[PDB]
Symmetry: C3
Subunit: 45 residues, 3 copies
């Protein structure tokens, strides 16, 4: 029973790391889109 | 303590699935914004 | 062994709450980028 809990925790921690990595990718891409939009705003000023 | 832990695991797993689904929705919307920015760059050229 | 499991659970719960707060912040920024793109699209309709 405790082994099964411990193993479930490993799977959850693994999935949580995949989630943190996806959030980091999202943040980088969102930064790039904000920069892109600001470049377009400056062009039409 | 074991049963409480199992109940908490079930909760965590449920929320993790919801988080994964929200990340998938965010990624799709972010891709649409990248396409929208590229279409504006194309158009100004 | 049981206290180690409980401490790890608590750590996973706290990281999950932080992930949910990060997702909320990303969604608000993404909505702003969408409205910024729409504004730019208009300035060329
Ligand atoms: Cl065991």
């Amino acid at each position: 029973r405790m082994k099964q809990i411990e193993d479930k925790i490993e799977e959850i921690e693994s999935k949580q790391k995949k989630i943190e990595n996806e959030i980091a990718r999202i943040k980088k891409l969102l930064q790039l889109t904000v920069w892109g939009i600001k470049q377009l705003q400056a062009r039409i000023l």
